[PDB]
Every structure is written in structure tokens, then in C-alpha cells.
Symmetry: D2
Subunit: 358 residues, 4 copies
């Protein structure tokens, strides 16, 4: 049966998720997008935001704005590839949303305002079965990183899942093969050269939380922080307290790169690792972890759905020749595309386990 | 006596105005800044916002954050060059501000949220005498462009004045000498290649008012609009309905250029105009209209306080050889700096006429 | 028969031209790319430059680098969609290139070094029949703007044709319908907000020719000049001396916009013009002049092969209400993509008239 | 006596060095700039490149272009603060320059074309005593990093000295106090988020050496390489083969940051290190190694002459809580300013040891 879904917050991640749904052909049959929600309800504005994107270009599907009853002035229904989607008005509280009435089982929380498990439980109280937070969730919700611990999902216990962060969906896959392939990680520190996002400012403005983050985004190298720092251990408990890091926000609208440095448990080599990541990429991590033997730059990873695509050359060429412990692993990721495709995956998977149980 | 002022909205224009006051040595003596208003009241954050600016660098003055009564945890008093300034908490309504209590006579409206005359009158109802709106004001407020019609100010009638816009303070001066020098403007269209502002987005987000204006700021040439379009006529009524224009927002954090194209009333030449603008610049428009014979680019105008600086070479070289009517006149302006300096001028000038009358 | 062509200068325009030949399916059959010429002859580097483009993404075709005789160390033959293309070594003089030997009849001059008719005649001296310069050529070569005067081509007289410039290929079609639709242009001045190009500098460096043009490309609004200023008249002789303009280079890697201002010969309205351009777009200018009724920004025109795509909303919204003469017409163009498509068009059309005659 | 010096390659580093000379007041008395060398000899163009700098603003001095004998058309002499400097024409070979004639003893090699000890010896063969290469020199010249091993200079042996690279002048001071304070570095890997330079392209062009490095500078995150990789060991031999790294070039015109991760020889803490670097900064490294306790971003470091300015907050905040070995140290530096100030320092100190001996 079509998985009944709703999108709360039709932003970068909101629209990229919807796009991954329509482009993989899932829309209408496999998955069913009932209603999207944002500040306005002008299906016309939504139609425009969908047809033209600065970084990803025009979507493969076809969208139209139609007003339901001719009495309403502004259009309020998107018609994507023969399928009516409703434009619901934004609520300050999740529990105010007409999910249950609408017939929405899986709510995708991507407004970014409700990262808390409790604040996000409101969707359930609004009539929804499950909720997938598009960011590191607080209040102890279940953090899952596809390709690493999706199996740990519990149809009975877990009703408010978190798909971690973009950096997390990049680092965790790597940390996974590293332990699984027995190279092990004693202590590690990582940095992510990150594209700027919606939360940064075009010009020096206010950001009471992070002082630096409020500076002119596209004009400075802004040291900041990463979700992946915390989130990594909640997926791979083995690394808890043994891994930490930061992020440098730089003047690029999309695509980021993880720069991991770690110490192995056993003596090994960079070729050994390089070989195991490529192998892992072609075997058990296929579709999640990929790699590259080319001299690529950031722009070359735009629209690349792999959670993390390891850089062969970059890594091999920048490690100590005589070394068996202290290593560096470079890996890229398109932070809006890959992550979004991982959210659709989680949904569909959660729906599979939900069909078995509840 | 020290003019009693307060700043509502300590942003780009907020902070540049306060800076123009300290840097011109006006702080404490000539002008007296009682309190600054913004989202937070942490003078420590304000301190930081003041000492490091991406585009204008470090201010000449000295700022410190001090908590008045040791009972308050976060500092709440700025000490700029030996002077206590209070950090007032932001109000949803202007009339809620403690102006009258604080002892503030002149309110500077720069939150951008109250461009309406009536929404702005609230400051008077809050205990303030006069109010200067740092943008084109609606509700029929008094629009004044220093160097063009400041004399028209009325201490009795006018209580909510508008300092026009940055593009207005650049176009108006030129339009003034064009008329005053008897060249006359029949019909005219203008474009302004403008740097982006706090109102634009880093990535493709929401902008319900102007659809294009919500696109990635630092990654596109975004056709938009300019305040100067309307505001120009409200200062030089002679041009009402005979002049209009647009603006292209481009990937630069500050400094813009006006590209005016018009038709003269009488036959004339580009040299005639070139000469008249230079003369005007050295005589009656000094300090407001300036000019350049150098091969400059945008960066060269940062921190230049002239409302408008005519570009001699770009103009002379880019006009028809055999022509007596159809002309082009290019001119630059640092939209955050010069405009801010004009705001202070308006206040001080207003305070002068208010000392004569009321 | 397959048109025998070779490209001199495999750069932005060089590579986009080759791409337009492969993507339209013309490669191998309709057109035959014999050899490409650049600094190096490493087919491997060529293949890399071909497979990853910052602004236009990965091409549709497939490319491989193969060394001909196993005796040569570096590969020297590209294999695009089953077709051997040779990597010729760059020559300081065109006449030194082995065109005639290789079997190349049509040379595409895109190094940027030989814009002179005489410097360009060298290819003929080197064994080539016809030469198309991808820029405004000097020495009085034949300037042609597809959709405007290609018919003026003379297989007997014209052997070194110039495809004008990108700005010329966007302004010309507009000027064409304005005259053909009898609106007439008395006097006109135009500005083009243009993306930066290979001739600009990342940081302040040398540009002995144009002083401003040597400044930090991606950080300033650099007043400069346009080829279209002169070239327009060499295509539409009727406008000679009646039109001129400048260009502002801005921080965007691709896609530019023309901002024309003119005075009509007869009284008319903006809607009349608007209607005529859309009509012209659907009729006799189809494929060359196009238009848009959407609220688009620069990124939205990437990969748009129309020589010029008129902006209806921007035009209609930014003109004087009571106006019958003084108008503004905004139009976009992808300076690398559209223009490159026009060069392939010119070649194939020239080959058609050359088959009739010589 | 005034040190006789000449600049070869009046570029970013060329002009910044000359500026450090004029601004520190050294021009004319302490140091004597005899002539500057570049592509052109037009003192007027030079005047222009000196008066307006995109990133550093207008220099404090005063420059003028004057033609010596009224017979020469273009000016050929710069008059900086009362002092005639000659504009010599660029030579393909160093040994062809008129150093000996001119009366130049110390040549500053900054064209970037002669990093080889042997290629640079040509200056001596041209009549010059000593030569300082503004970049890691090959051919085994003497690599000196002020504040780390300048004392190792030998007025007798060393005649072609190399001032290392910008990143090197940033990492070395840090590696110095790390060993000097007995924290010891077992194995280390570093990354530098670096601003783009004059060797990168505005748009996807040719760069046969580094494939990635030829991609659009201001639009990508380009993994590349750093000089400091090798150079570090040639200054602190104790680290040879124990330290290596890479650089990620990002869309910023100036100011970079080093991100070092290493393993200590002995158990220790981040606070210990933090303490030792601030201490060292206030004692034996003063003027070379500085630090900051503020929430700074890239633009804050522009015009900061310290070779390396440690970031206290970024480091303290981003290290493992329970950790005695695996650490991270973040440090900024203005790659054009600081480094240039180190070149002037090296010269004058070389001059000191040369007055003692030869
Ligand atoms: N951009 C990335 O690289 C990325 C990647 C992975 C995860 N995320 C995370 O997922 C979340 C999505 O953020 P984003 O970067 O897409 O920003 P965004 O601003 O594009 O998305 C937020 C959307 O929520 C809307 N919104 C605000 N309040 C709402 C409400 N009450 N109800 C409904 N909609 C509301 C906003 O208008 C906006 O369109 C963030 O927390 C972000 O950290 C972002
Ligand atoms: N920067 C320019 O180029 C420029 C030029 C001319 C005029 N202006 C005009 O001045 C205004 C502001 O421009 P800006 O660049 O300063 O914008 P900004 O975003 O920098 O200013 C808004 C500031 O006011 C604060 N604020 C919002 N609501 C507030 C409230 N209710 N009370 C107190 N503070 C509040 C915001 O937090 C922020 O600090 C607009 O009207 C704008 O047109 C700006
Ligand atoms: N990109 C645009 O905006 C654009 C648009 C219209 C017209 N044009 C014109 O097209 C031409 C191509 O320009 P571009 O922007 O592609 O520049 P580009 O710098 O990317 O292309 C020039 C290429 O020519 C190569 N080259 C130089 N000398 C050579 C020689 N002797 N032999 C062989 N190859 C040589 C260079 O190595 C470089 O690869 C220029 O004349 C330009 O004015 C460019
Ligand atoms: N820019 C930095 O961050 C930085 C940091 C450390 C070291 N340096 C070194 O400075 C060196 C020069 O780089 P830059 O950043 O000044 O670049 P630049 O290209 O701006 O300056 C080099 C200059 O040399 C001139 N030149 C070239 N060939 C010449 C020749 N044959 N004769 C005379 N003059 C010639 C050029 O015209 C140019 O002006 C590089 O090796 C670089 O590594 C620069």
C-alpha cells in the first residue's frame, strides 16, 4: 500500500526529499505525499520553488498549482505527476497539524524547529503514527544512519526516529567499515569543510547561539560546529567518547568534505585502508558509501546520492609514507541531495518493519 | 546641548550610524546615544558585533560591556569612549519602548519593521519627540535627501522623517544638479547593480513578497527592485512620473553602482554634463556628491561617505559620440556607509531647526 | 558528407562547441571533429576537462584517451562516442598547423589569440578552406549573427567569418525584431551585467589593456566593456552609430543579462513590444530568441541554448506607465552555452552554402 | 647604511613586501628599494596597482609615476615618499637583470618562476650579493622560518635563502613551541583551509601540473597541496618524515587557517598546550606567533602581520575531553601580509649577519 507521508517544512531538505521521491518514481504508488506544510499555502509559490533550483536545477517531474474550490483565491493544491498534494498552513505546534484527519502516517519533520523528541511527538498527538526528524534529535529519540544501524529500528519502541545529520551520514559509514574491517579506531578527531546553509547570514547579523555563525557567510571562513560530533556515537556506541570534531563553513552553496584523522588499534597501511573502503563500497555499503579515483573538486559531487564518497587520490597522496597508525581519510558528500535520499530510504524501511509489526 | 538619541535595530545601518557618530567625534558631546535596541540585551554580543565587521573592519573607538547592578548576569551597558549606553530589550510595538523615561528625544528607526509613518509614530507615543526612518517610509512621512531638500524640513509639521534609501541618496544628488544646471530631464530609466543585503537568503529559501529575491544571494544575478524608484519623486517633485528604475542584486557584500539613462530637455553634450557634475561636486554638493577620474572598481569605494561618487571615465567613455540628448551617467556609493553618514547629518540638522522652533 | 572540422583552443568555448556537437548527435555523421588543439596533447587531461565541468556538469557523450602507437608515452587521441580525435600540439602561428594534411576544411578559431582576419587567414595557409572566429574579429572579417544575417554569407568572398560575441548574439536578435516589427530605434545605450571569464584575475594582477579588468574578479563589480558595442552595427548596418554601451563584470561564473534602453521612432507601448518579441520568438526567431514569463534568476538560464531569452516580467514591470518612446528591454543568455551552439550552427550553415558553391 | 634591495616580480607578494617596507618606515633610510621588476615598466600602471588593493585597501605611503628623461613616453620611475625607484623591464633569465649595475645587493625573488636555487643564482651572476626566494626553493637552498631558525643563516655558505611558504610560516612556529616546551610530536597530519591565489583560475581552465587546481577558483572547494608539507622538516629536522599534510582551497581572496592534528610523546592536556602557546606568544615568539581568545572569522585576520595566530576558543572547544595524546590546534594567518612581513624581516636580519661577516 502507498506509504502515507507528509512534509513539515518545505525547505532545502523538505524539497529535496520530495524530489527524491518523485525522481525515483516512488511518488503516487510506493510512497504517497499527502500534504506539504510551510509559511504560505500558495501552491503557486511552491510550484515556483520546485521548478527552479539554484544548485540542483529543474526537477525531472512536472508540477502545477490548482485551487480546489473556485472560492479560494490562491491555489492550494500541487499536482505533481498526476497526484494532488495539499498545501497545509504552518502551525507553531506540531500537535495542531491535521495529520490524522488528512490520513498521514509518516510525518517528515524538516522545519528544523522541533529537533526535540518531545516537541516532535506532537505529530503523533496530531494523529500520526511515526515521525522522522531530518536532523540530530534531542530528548533521546532513535538515531539511525542508513547502512550502519537501520536494523536496530524497533516498530514497537521507536516512533520518533532521527536520521542524524549530513556530516554524520558521511562519517558514520566510514567509521563503520573501519571497525568492521578490523582496523579499529583508538582516538579520532575530524574536521568538515562545509558549504553554508539556510541558518547563516548573507551579511553580519544576529546569531545569539553561535557568535561566529552570524557573520557574512559567503565572505569568510567561519569555524563552527558539527552535529556529527555527537550523533556519531549514538549510531556506533563503540566510538562514544573516542571521536570528536569541528566544521569550517566556507563560501560554497552546496557540497561538503569530511577530513578525518585517526589512530588505528593495530598496525596497518593506507593502501590497506584504501583497499578495504573500495571493497566495502562495492559490497555491503553499496549505494551508501562510494569512492573516487579521479581528481574531483566540490562541484563534481552535486546531485550525487551516495551518503559519503571517499576520495582515493586525496587520501593516498596525503598520508605519511612510513606509517602504520596515524591516518587521514578524505570523503565528500552533497549535503542536501544524499542526506535527502537517505530520509526517503529510512521512511520506506521503517514502513517495511511497520508492516511486519506496528 | 547633547542631542538625545536612541537606535532601534542595531543592524548594518544601525551599527554604521552609531559608528559614524563615534568616528566623527560627535559621541558624548555633540550627540548623545542613550540606548541601543535589539533582539538581545547582551552588551557582550553587541561589543563583539562592534569590534569586528567583515566589510568595514574594526571601528576607531573603544567599546566595553559592563553589567550595571552586579545582580544581572549578562552585561547590559556599552561603554564607548567613556560613555554609558543602555541595552534595551526589543519590543513588538514601538510605543512600548521607554523612550520618554530614558530621556530620548530623537529615535532612529532601523529595524526595517516599521517603515510606516503610523507604525513609526509609536516612538512619539513612547515618549520621543522626533523619529528618523532609515528607509523609504510609508503613510506619507517626510522624505528628505540631504543636499537636495533638507531645508524643506518643518520642526512643527514634520515629526516622522524618512532619509530615503541608499539608491535614492545616490540618484537624487545627480538628478538635482542635472535640473539645477538647466540640462533638464525629460524621461529617464535607471538600473542599479546592487550588493546583497540582510534581507536576502544564502540559499534558495522563502521570500513571499519578491519571488526572485529569495534565491541564493551570493550565487545569482537577481533582478529585483529599488526604493529610489518611488522616493526620488518625493524629494524632487519635478521628476514625479518622469523617472523609474530597477536593480540587479549581485554577489558582493557592499558598495553599489547607479547606471542612469535619460533624455535632456535641451541639446547638450556629455562633456558639458561631466564638467557640471565636477563643478557641482566642488561647490554646492561638496560632501554629498563627489567624483572620480580614476579607473576604480567596487572595492575601492568601501568606507567612502559621499552619498554619490560620479564615475568620470566610465561615463565619458560609454556615451554616443554624436549626441546631444540621450545620455548615461554612472555613479557609485557605499550603501551602508555613506547612507549611515547621511542619517547622522539629518538628525543633527533636524536638531538645529528644532532648537530654533520645536 | 561529414563536415571536416578542427578546433583551435580547447577552452570554455572550445569545449562547449565540441559538446554541442556531441550532444545534438552531430558527431561522427553530420559533423566530423578531426583534431583539437591546445597547450598540451595529453588526451588524458583533455578527457578530464571534458568529463567534469564546474558550471555545466558532465556531458552526455563518453570520452576516452588512447595513445596511438604504443611508442608514445602519453595518450594522444580522444575517443568520443566511437570516433578517433587527434590531439594536435599548439602552434604560435595558425599557418604552422597541419590542417590540410589532417583533412580539416573548417577551422574553429577559439584560442582568443587570433581575432584578426589576417592572423586567422593562416589556417587557410595551413591547408584549411574556411575559418570561423569565436569572437569579434578585426581586419574586416565577415561578422554574422545567426538569425539576423547569416544569409549574407558569401561562399566565394567570405572565407574568414566571425560569429560576433556572446553579448552581440543576445542584443542583435532583439534589435532585429525591433526594426523588422517597425518600432524602430532612434538612439540606444545598453549595459550588460556579465559573468566573469577566463581573461579576468582571481586576485589583483596584471591587465595592461584594461586597468579595471585586472582586479579580483569574484569580489568586485568591475566596469568594463563589451564586444557587442561595435559588432552590433556590423550585422545591422541600420544601427551603426545609433547604439553603444558598456558592461559590468560581476561575481558569477556564467550567465549574463542585457539591459537595453532605447528611444523608438514611432509612438508605441511596452505591451506592444512585449507582444511582438513573444510573437517573433514563436515565429521567425524560434530557437534563437526565446522569452520567459517566469520570475527567474541567473542560475535558471544555465544550459539554455537560445541566443537571447527576453524577460517579460522584468521588462513589463520596469518601464514608465505613461510612455510611448523611452523603453527598457531586459534579456538573459548563457554566454558559453548559447553562443557555442550558434558557432556549430554557423559552421553547418556555411557548409550548406559551400556545397552549393565553394 | 641603507640595504640595497630590488624586487623581481611585483605581484601580490611583491607589492605587499614593498608595502611592509614603506609602512614600517624603513623605506629610504633603513632599507633602500632601488628598482622593481615586472612585465611592463609603466610606472603609471604600477602607481595604480599600488594605490588601490581589493583586499588590503590603500597603502599608507604616497606614490607617483614620473618619466626620467622627457624623451621616454611612459613614466618609468616611482616616487614613493620622496625616493626614486626604477621600473626595470622583465627578463626571461635572472642573470640578465642589471643588478650589479643598479647597485642592488639583495634581490627578492617573487615572480614565482625561479624557485630553483640554480635558476635564482642568476641574480648573483647578474651582479647581486644575496637572494631571498619568497617561496619554498628547490635545488637545496637554505630554508629559514623567522622565529624558528634564522640564526642558522651563514653569511658565508648561504647566498640563496628561501623564506618558506605562507602555511610553513604558520605551522613552523607552532611545531617549534610544541617541541621546545617538551610536548613533543610523535606523528602528525595537517590540513590548511586556504584562500585561492594568483595561480588559480576564475573559470575551468588549464593547469597541467595539478589537475584539480585548474577548476573555477571561487566556486569550488579544491583539494590541493601545500608547500609547508615538505618545508617544515627543512627548518625543524626533528619533524622530517613525522609530519605531512594537504590544503583545501576555498572561495576566499585572503586569510587562511591551519588545522593541525598530532600525537604527543608524553601524556598532557589541551589546557597545558593552550597555556604554553599563549605563554610562548608573550615571550620568545612575540611578533611571530600571536593568539586570540575571541570568536573571530577569516576577515578578522586581514592585515594581521603575525606569522601564525593561534585560536584559543576553536582549539579548546574542539578536542576530546578525556585526552592526553591526540590533539588538534587551529591557527590563522594572513597569507599575503604576514608572510611579506617575514620577508622584510629576513632581509634586514640577513643584512645584519652580512655586515658582521660577508
Ligand atoms: N541543508 C543541509 O545541508 C541539511 C542537511 C541535512 C539536514 N538538514 C537539517 O534539516 C533541517 C532542515 O533545514 P534546511 O537547511 O532545509 O532549512 P530551510 O530553511 O530550507 O528549511 C526549513 C523550512 O521550514 C519552514 N518552516 C519554519 N517554521 C515552520 C513551521 N512552523 N511549520 C512548517 N514549516 C516551517 C521554513 O520556511 C523553511 O522553508 C535543519 O535542521 C537542518 O539542519 C540540513
Ligand atoms: N544596508 C543597506 O544597504 C541599507 C541602506 C539604506 C537603508 N537601509 C534600511 O534600513 C533598514 C535596515 O537595513 P539593515 O541592513 O540594518 O538590516 P538588518 O537586518 O541589519 O537590521 C535589522 C536589525 O534590527 C533587529 N530587529 C528586528 N526587529 C527588531 C525589533 N522589533 N526591535 C529591535 N530590533 C529589531 C534585527 O535583529 C537586526 O538587528 C531597512 O529599512 C533598510 O532598507 C539599509
Ligand atoms: N566564455 C565566454 O564568455 C565567451 C563567449 C563568447 C565568445 N568568447 C570568445 O571565445 C574565445 C574562447 O574564449 P574562452 O573564454 O573559451 O577562453 P579559454 O581561455 O578557456 O580558451 C582559450 C584556450 O585557448 C588555448 N590556447 C591559447 N593559445 C593557444 C594556441 N596557440 N594554440 C592552441 N590553443 C591555445 C588556451 O591554452 C586555452 O585553453 C575568446 O576569444 C572569447 O572572447 C568567449
Ligand atoms: N600569495 C600567497 O599566498 C603567497 C604566500 C607565500 C609565498 N608566496 C609566493 O609569492 C610567489 C609569487 O606569487 P604572488 O602571490 O605574488 O603572485 P603574482 O602572480 O601576483 O606575483 C608574481 C608576479 O611576478 C610577475 N612576473 C612573472 N614573471 C616574471 C618574470 N619572468 N619577470 C619579472 N616579473 C615577473 C608577474 O607579472 C606577477 O605580477 C609565489 O611563489 C608564492 O608561493 C605567495
Amino acid at each position: 500500500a502507498p506509504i502515507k507521508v507528509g512534509i513539515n517544512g518545505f525547505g532545502r531538505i523538505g524539497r529535496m526529499v520530495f524530489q527524491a521521491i518523485c525522481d525515483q518514481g516512488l511518488i503516487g504508488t510506493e510512497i504517497d505525499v499527502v500534504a506539504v506544510v510551510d509559511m504560505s499555502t500558495n501552491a503557486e509559490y511552491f510550484a515556483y520553488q520546485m521548478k527552479h533550483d539554484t544548485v540542483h536545477g529543474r526537477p525531472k517531474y512536472t508540477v502545477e498549482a490548482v485551487k480546489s474550490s473556485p472560492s479560494v483565491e490562491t491555489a492550494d493544491v500541487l499536482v505533481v505527476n498526476g497526484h494532488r498534494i495539499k498545501c497545509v498552513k504552518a502551525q507553531r505546534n506540531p500537535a495542531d497539524l491535521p495529520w490524522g484527519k488528512l490520513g498521514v502516517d509518516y510525518v517528515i519533520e524538516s522545519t528544523g524547529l522541533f529537533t526535540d523528541k518531545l516537541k516532535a511527538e506532537g505529530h503523533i498527538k496530531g494523529g500520526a503514527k511515526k515521525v522522522v526528524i531530518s536532523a540530530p534529535a534531542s530528548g533521546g529519540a532513535k538515531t539511525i544512519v542508513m547502512g550502519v544501524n537501520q536494523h536496530e529500528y524497533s516498530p514497537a519502541s521507536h516512533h520518533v526516529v532521527s536520521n542524524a545529520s549530513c556530516t554524520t551520514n558521511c562519517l558514520a559509514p566510514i567509521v563503520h567499515v573501519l571497525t568492521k574491517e578490523n582496523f579499529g579506531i583508538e582516538t579520532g578527531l575530524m574536521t568538515t569543510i562545509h558549504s553554508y546553509t539556510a541558518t547563516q547570514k548573507t551579511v553580519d547579523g544576529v546569531s545569539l547561539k553561535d557568535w561566529r555563525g552570524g557573520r557574512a557567510a559567503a565572505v569568510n571562513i567561519i569555524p563552527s560546529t558539527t552535529g556529527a560530533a555527537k550523533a556519531v556515537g549514538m549510531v556506533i556506541p563503540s566510538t562514544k567518547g573516542k571521536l570528536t570534531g569541528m566544521s569550517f563553513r566556507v563560501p560554497t552553496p552546496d557540497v561538503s568534505v569530511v577530513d578525518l584523522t585517526f589512530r588505528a588499534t593495530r598496525d596497518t597501511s593506507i593502501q590497506e585502508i584504501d583497499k578495504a573502503i573500495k571493497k566495502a563500497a562495492q559490497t555491503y555499503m553499496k549505494g551508501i558509501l562510494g569512492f573516487t579515483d579521479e581528481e574531483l573538486v566540490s562541484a563534481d559531487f552535486i546531485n550525487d546520492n551516495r551518503s559519503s564518497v571517499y576520495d582515493s587520490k586525496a587520501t593516498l597522496q596525503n598520508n605519511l609514507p612510513g606509517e602504520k597508525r596515524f591516518f587521514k581519510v578524505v570523503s565528500w558528500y552533497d549535503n542536501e541531495w544524499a542526506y535527502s535520499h537517505r530520509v526517503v530510504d529510512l521512511v520506506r524501511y521503517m514502513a517495511a518493519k511497520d508492516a511486519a509489526s506496528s
